[PDB]
Ligand binder design. Sequence first.
Ligand code: MG
Ligand code: MG
Ligand code: MG
Ligand code: MG
Ligand code: MG
Ligand code: MG
Ligand code: MG
Ligand code: MG
Ligand code: MG
Ligand code: MG
Ligand code: MG
Ligand code: MG
Ligand code: MG
Ligand code: MG
Ligand code: MG
Ligand code: MG
Ligand code: MG
Ligand code: MG
Ligand code: MG
Ligand code: MG
Ligand code: MG
Ligand code: MG
Ligand code: MG
Ligand code: MG
Ligand code: MG
Ligand code: MG
Ligand code: MG
Ligand code: MG
Ligand code: MG
Ligand code: MG
Ligand code: MG
Ligand code: MG
Ligand code: MG
Ligand code: MG
Ligand code: MG
Ligand code: MG
Ligand code: MG
Ligand code: MG
Ligand code: MG
Ligand code: MG
Ligand code: MG
Ligand code: MG
Ligand code: MG
Ligand code: MG
Ligand code: MG
Ligand code: MG
Ligand code: MG
Ligand code: MG
Ligand code: MG
Ligand code: ZN
Lengths: 91, 51, 114, 69, 120
Amino acid sequence: AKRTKKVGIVGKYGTRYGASLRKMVKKIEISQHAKYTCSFCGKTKMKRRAVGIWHCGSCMKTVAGGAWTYNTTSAVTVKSAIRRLKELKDQ
Amino acid sequence: GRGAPLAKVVFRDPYRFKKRTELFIAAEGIHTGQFVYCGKKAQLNIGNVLP
Amino acid sequence: VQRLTYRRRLSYNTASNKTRLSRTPGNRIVYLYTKKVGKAPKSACGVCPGRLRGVRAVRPKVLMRLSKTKKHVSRAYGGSMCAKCVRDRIKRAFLIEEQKIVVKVLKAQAQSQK
Amino acid sequence: PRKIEEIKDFLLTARRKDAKSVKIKKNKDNVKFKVRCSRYLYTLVITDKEKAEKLKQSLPPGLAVKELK
Amino acid sequence: CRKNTLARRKGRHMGIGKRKGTANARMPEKVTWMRRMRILRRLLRRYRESKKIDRHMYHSLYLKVKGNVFKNKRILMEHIHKLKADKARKKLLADQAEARRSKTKEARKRREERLQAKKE
RNA sequence: AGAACUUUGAAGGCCGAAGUGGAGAAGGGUUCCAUGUGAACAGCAGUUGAACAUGGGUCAGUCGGUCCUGAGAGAUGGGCGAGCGCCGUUCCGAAGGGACGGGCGAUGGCCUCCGUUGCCCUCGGCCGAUCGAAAGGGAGUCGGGUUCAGAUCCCCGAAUCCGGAGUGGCGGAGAUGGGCGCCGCGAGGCGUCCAGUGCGGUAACGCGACCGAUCCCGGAGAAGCCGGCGGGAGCCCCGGGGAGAGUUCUCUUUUCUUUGUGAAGGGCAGGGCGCCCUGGAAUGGGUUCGCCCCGAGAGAGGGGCCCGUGCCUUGGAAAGCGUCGCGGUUCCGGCGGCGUCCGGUGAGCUCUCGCUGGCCCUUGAAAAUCCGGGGGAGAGGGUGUAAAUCUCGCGCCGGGCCGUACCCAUAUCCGCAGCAGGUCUCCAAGGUGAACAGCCUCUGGCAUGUUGGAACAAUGUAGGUAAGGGAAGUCGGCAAGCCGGAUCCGUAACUUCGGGAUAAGGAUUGGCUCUAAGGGCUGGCAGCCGACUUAGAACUGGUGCGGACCAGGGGAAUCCGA
RNA sequence: CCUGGGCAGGGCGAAGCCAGAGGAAACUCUGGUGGAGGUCCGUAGCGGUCCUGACGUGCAAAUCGGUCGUCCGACCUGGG
Ligand SMILES: [Mg+2]
Ligand SMILES: [Mg+2]
Ligand SMILES: [Mg+2]
Ligand SMILES: [Mg+2]
Ligand SMILES: [Mg+2]
Ligand SMILES: [Mg+2]
Ligand SMILES: [Mg+2]
Ligand SMILES: [Mg+2]
Ligand SMILES: [Mg+2]
Ligand SMILES: [Mg+2]
Ligand SMILES: [Mg+2]
Ligand SMILES: [Mg+2]
Ligand SMILES: [Mg+2]
Ligand SMILES: [Mg+2]
Ligand SMILES: [Mg+2]
Ligand SMILES: [Mg+2]
Ligand SMILES: [Mg+2]
Ligand SMILES: [Mg+2]
Ligand SMILES: [Mg+2]
Ligand SMILES: [Mg+2]
Ligand SMILES: [Mg+2]
Ligand SMILES: [Mg+2]
Ligand SMILES: [Mg+2]
Ligand SMILES: [Mg+2]
Ligand SMILES: [Mg+2]
Ligand SMILES: [Mg+2]
Ligand SMILES: [Mg+2]
Ligand SMILES: [Mg+2]
Ligand SMILES: [Mg+2]
Ligand SMILES: [Mg+2]
Ligand SMILES: [Mg+2]
Ligand SMILES: [Mg+2]
Ligand SMILES: [Mg+2]
Ligand SMILES: [Mg+2]
Ligand SMILES: [Mg+2]
Ligand SMILES: [Mg+2]
Ligand SMILES: [Mg+2]
Ligand SMILES: [Mg+2]
Ligand SMILES: [Mg+2]
Ligand SMILES: [Mg+2]
Ligand SMILES: [Mg+2]
Ligand SMILES: [Mg+2]
Ligand SMILES: [Mg+2]
Ligand SMILES: [Mg+2]
Ligand SMILES: [Mg+2]
Ligand SMILES: [Mg+2]
Ligand SMILES: [Mg+2]
Ligand SMILES: [Mg+2]
Ligand SMILES: [Mg+2]
Ligand SMILES: [Zn+2]
């Protein structure tokens, strides 16, 4: 069945620590405990290690990623800007 | 004690027949098996430390 | 139900003082010590985890007593590579050598055209 | 404690010098020969009493022999 | 205590008033589930080894035993009897319909051969 | 001489496996043990003691220190300081005395040829001397017996490691093959030439051994906590057998005790495998309690590896144990017979191995040591004759220094003492029960905690009841008492929607007969063999049922602090 | 700071998963499995609230007895 209606993953804390804090911890605990699809092997076995380290069960290929998700949107912006300024007139 | 993840990049030493091992701060988006290019005229991508 | 005790003058249940229990010929439950388990040498350099096959797995200083069959595999890169690394590195080295020959003769043909 | 199976290899080992003692033990269903050479106790188990008697007959004479009960 | 334990095995001294832990403490839910589902998940193998159920319906009943549908071995066997008796009826009726279709296609192709021979 | 206390017997008790038990670390220092005394000390006494006096007792290549580094501490170089000195641990330093081969030279032994020494060439980061753990790292020993006191040390028997062996102990590999031509019937031999730094399996890998230097690479050493689950052991439990003991008023094929195989080697179970081959899968399939896995190769079949602490074998029945007898005063680890069996079950306990998962802005030690691999400078017999070498099987020699007694505590330590205080760990049975809860027994200890006798006044200190009323007492429901376990019902206001909540309130609970359900193993749906749980029914006891022990009063509100 | 050691049973039942029912979709409902928590009753352990209980020239220059708080942790603890 559906055992909780709102708290989702944050129900392990209970009635303490505060509403907005649980609300803001929800949206990134789901991110850090979610399995991600590896861009290398194509399986869905990414798992977060210690902070900043991501690991896939197949092929043991360990990628330095974001602290809570797999890619920071700012980091994707920086990578697009780096390839643009790369092929901009060859330095 | 450091929030940054720490990369262990191995180099070839051009003077003694020996591999040397250094410790770089892991730039966002490198992974085990990506080559790291460093030097003056090194091409510009993520991880490539250059002047 | 015979309660039984350490034989040495240790007391603390350390990692080194790790014990089992047996039965004497003299009809008595005694408390016999145990050498620690020696994990096998694991694979060379970054590959999928798993110890190297066909190696007598012991503590380090045990390896002085052992003969020169039970420490290595008959293959080249015996007790270091896990043989999937061997059948990768051979193909990798050969193909990179062939690509270097192709790039070198391409430079030669480019200079011939120029 | 090592176990010998052939009579030949046992006998050669018995004549292999600095083996100082042979015990002979009789049993309900078999008979055993103990050789105390060095670093080891060489046991030959055999079930045929006639073979044991002819082996002890052909046993080398300078070596000590002790029967156990 | 041997006399008392034989009285326990009869089923005496075991009402409400001489229990003190909960039912989940006396015989746990996880233990009930492990025993129950190891029994039901090896009975399906004992059928699948022989021929009691084919490879495709094995997986459906495997998931339906993983889900809390079947309580025990007897009603599992009663339900496998019903599914097998349903599959046999449906395959019999389909084979009879395919026999009728084979008769009609045979007759049509033979009539086409008859008209071909009337042409040549 | 003397007995409320000493010792023995009998009886009744306690500690009740998280102990008043069996042993240790730190500490104590002879208290350990025997003999003798009872003057003082033990707060009464004492024939006794941890008191006094005499005399004994601590045996180790394989137990630990020694060795390694950790948190750190500390010296020279350097700097500072009136100055004993301080700072400082790579910083401002010429901080390696070693080796490989080669050459020149010398010396000595069997001057064959080995062994030294001097010089020269080549090579060689030390992230720095040295110290730092009787719980971290660290090769290698277990069983039986033995004393008034020892014990993995003494003995008996069985093993193992580390070194060393130069004229290289003894064997085995390296190793002896093939062609040519001739002779010989042939078997073989002659002569010439050539090879020979091992072999097998498609693999995963295997065998008894398998030349290797400077150097380089890697692994082991080397990893947290918590869940689950599987195997193995030990213990407990059940059924049958065998020895001995108890009960027999009446019954009880009854109750209890006892019922063994060391390290090391070989083999076989078993478990695990991210380890290979054949082979292509979707109507998706395989598997866990949970997951998880699959074209980067699932299922299926066949192979391979590791742990093998389990079983068998060697040790090993000669011992050990139980029991029944026979001899020697003693001195005998005497002597002899008999036996030391079968099986089964398990959310059972405890330990360990392995798998997998969860948790993290915690990522969970370093080094001595040892090994493998990459490379191939070199080394060696050159042929009918054998070496360079060897981590293989045997054989020889040695393993130095120190600690080792005992308490480890309601009497050997600290606390001014034989002081309810304090102090670090291991093993831990049966029943009830959820359980290591509390209560009662068994192994194993013990005399009630620095005294006894007589009587049962007050006040006490700990405990327990009370007719009626139920907070009226008192600053105050302080104290004590009520509910208390489980099952089945039922659960509000409020709210961060997770709770509140075991809310509040009810009922039921015993003994004894059953009934129903919940499984394993066999065979071409049927036959044998078993676990402890749940639901229901009847009978019945003086309304009695968590019967002792175990054990939440509750609600309504306010203030403050998440 | 380093190196080791230690913590019985149970109640509450999140994420993830499975099955069934409904829905056109979004998704919802029901029964299991699952075992998270600076989580709840409670053992050892650690503290010391109340009785202003015992003692108060004591057993003791801070103890004892009931009654207590917390026990996977910002936990407890030995040695260096
Ligand atoms: Mg559950
Ligand atoms: Mg008298
Ligand atoms: Mg007394
Ligand atoms: Mg008692
Ligand atoms: Mg004790
Ligand atoms: Mg006195
Ligand atoms: Mg005396
Ligand atoms: Mg004494
Ligand atoms: Mg004295
Ligand atoms: Mg010895
Ligand atoms: Mg040692
Ligand atoms: Mg100094
Ligand atoms: Mg100076
Ligand atoms: Mg040191
Ligand atoms: Mg140690
Ligand atoms: Mg002995
Ligand atoms: Mg002793
Ligand atoms: Mg040697
Ligand atoms: Mg197990
Ligand atoms: Mg063995
Ligand atoms: Mg079992
Ligand atoms: Mg001692
Ligand atoms: Mg005391
Ligand atoms: Mg005390
Ligand atoms: Mg224990
Ligand atoms: Mg018990
Ligand atoms: Mg029970
Ligand atoms: Mg007495
Ligand atoms: Mg006393
Ligand atoms: Mg009254
Ligand atoms: Mg009354
Ligand atoms: Mg009333
Ligand atoms: Mg008032
Ligand atoms: Mg009170
Ligand atoms: Mg009352
Ligand atoms: Mg309330
Ligand atoms: Mg409370
Ligand atoms: Mg207000
Ligand atoms: Mg507060
Ligand atoms: Mg809590
Ligand atoms: Mg509460
Ligand atoms: Mg309580
Ligand atoms: Mg407590
Ligand atoms: Mg206390
Ligand atoms: Mg206190
Ligand atoms: Mg107090
Ligand atoms: Mg007071
Ligand atoms: Mg007084
Ligand atoms: Mg609590
Ligand atoms: Zn991957």
